[PDB]
Amino acid sequence: DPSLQIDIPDALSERDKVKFTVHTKTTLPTFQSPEFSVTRQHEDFVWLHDTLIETTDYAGLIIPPAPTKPDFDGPREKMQKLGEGEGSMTKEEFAKMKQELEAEYLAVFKKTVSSHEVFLQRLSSHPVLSKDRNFHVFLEYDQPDPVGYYYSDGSLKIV
Amino acid sequence: PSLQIDIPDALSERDKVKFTVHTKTTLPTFQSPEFSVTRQHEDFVWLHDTLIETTDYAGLIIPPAPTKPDFDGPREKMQKLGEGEGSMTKEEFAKMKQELEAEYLAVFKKTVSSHEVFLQRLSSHPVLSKDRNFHVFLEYDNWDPVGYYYSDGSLKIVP
Ligand SMILES: [Cl-]
């Protein structure tokens, strides 16, 4: 489906509130531009799903489930038991334990990014919902400094 | 395959680059088989100088230091563009910010490869690969980190 291609290439979590980058590649004329990105929070996805669910014309349609709210609590307080407890172990078994707790944080971050992304892709596939204008507002409504840049795999990304 | 080094990503805050130095190893010397650290250009310079002034490596081939990352050309163009935002159309501010970002990206790609080739050359060298100062550079680990930045299946700390 060249028509509408959506991905979440990156995300930021500060204090376990997540800001997702929603990147759209489309050939459909409804959109102002062929490629664009916006930053979204979980409430935006909930609004999108609930708006589709409450549309009368989509009664009985297959509406892909909403992504679950991001939850970092399991890793977060595990991190605060260890993190502020250096003197409890060796310098190297503090380091070891700090890495796998961050590995736990990564597992949660990856799955919630995939959870929010799969939702957007399923909408893209749907012949009715993919043309929904509330979906389109979710993809492109935009606009709130070159301080910081992240380089990976030959690509530049802003903070 | 024993000792494998790459720089998967890097972060530039105020044009100071923090490189992700990623190590995949099966050798018993390292506390972990695969691990990653953040290094800055001064750390690479220190390693090169330590090797040069090491007596046991006197006649060896020492790979040149990576060039210091230089973003000045794009940076000043960027600071001017930033000051004329309110002076031009939003469509021509987008165009020029895209061109300066591509210019910034070219410098970023070239200095990341400059730093990575140095590490891989050290890696490949039969003597130098096994120097513990190099091991300190690969394995050794100022504020709290704000949150976590997710991209490419990886976590990066944001300060
Ligand atoms: Cl905020």
From Swiss-Prot, chain A:
Signal peptide: none annotated. This is Sorting nexin-5. Belongs to the sorting nexin family. A 1,2-diacyl-sn-glycero-3-phospho-(1D-myo-inositol-4,5-bisphosphate) binds at residues 13-19, 72-78, 86-89. Residues 1-143 form the PX domain. The gene is SNX5. Forms heterodimers with BAR domain-containing sorting nexins SNX1 and SNX2; does not homodimerize. The heterodimers are proposed to self-assemble into helical arrays on the membrane to stabilize and expand local membrane curvature underlying endosomal tubule formation. (Microbial infection) Interacts with human cytomegalovirus proteins UL35 and UL35A; these interactions inhibit the ability of USP7 to form nuclear bodies. The PX domain mediates interaction with membranes enriched in phosphatidylinositol 3,4-bisphosphate and/or phosphatidylinositol 4,5-bisphosphate. It is found in: Endosome; Early endosome; Early endosome membrane; Cell membrane. Involved in several stages of intracellular trafficking. Interacts with membranes containing phosphatidylinositol 3-phosphate (PtdIns(3P)) or phosphatidylinositol 3,4-bisphosphate (PtdIns(3,4)P2). Acts in part as component of the retromer membrane-deforming SNX-BAR subcomplex. The SNX-BAR retromer mediates retrograde transport of cargo proteins from endosomes to the trans-Golgi network (TGN) and is involved in endosome-to-plasma membrane transport for cargo protein recycling. The chain holds residues 28 to 170 of 404 of the full protein. It comes from the Eukaryota.
